[PDB]
Amino acid sequence: IAGVADLNNMSELGCPFIEKWCEDHCESKKQVGKCENFDCSCVKLGGK
Secondary structure, three states: OOOOOOOOOOOOHHOOOHHHHHHHHHHHHOOOOEOOOOEEEEEOOOOO
């Protein structure tokens, strides 16, 4: 279960309705944010 056996996880093309919510959280943290198709991840450098 926890290893998932799935590739390219943090591509926003696999989570394009979720990238919005990750930007909203990581913005509060001064990060840019990205989605990993189940949760979010806060990249400190970014800009799409």
